[PDB]
Amino acid sequence: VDNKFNKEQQNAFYEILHLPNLNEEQRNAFIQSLKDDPSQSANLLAEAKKLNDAQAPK
Amino acid sequence: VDNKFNKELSVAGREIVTLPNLNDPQKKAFIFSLWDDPSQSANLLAEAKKLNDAQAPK
Incomplete structure (x- = not known):
């Protein structure tokens, strides 16, 4: 029992939506894995951040 | 009633x-309240544009 995952899903959700290279398929799927799984929320933002740089233009 | 409205955060949240x-x-x-209760996600998205008008004209 902790208050980290309570807003980590909130911050990861927000960051998934605010990532400059996340699209509706990546950002919404994250909100599906984030709203259903609270413990993977930080990883979801990390993978969304991971997608932001991988999907980003180079 | 909320039924895992994750798709609504992709449209409302983004x-x-x-x-x-x-x-x-x-x-x-806004997103942090949208994440806590996506039942109002449709109303949150509208609240986002409605609030945008107070700072600048649409």
């Missing part, structure tokens, strides 16, 4: 994340 007249602190609390 539009609340970057609507044309909103600032970063309002969308932050």
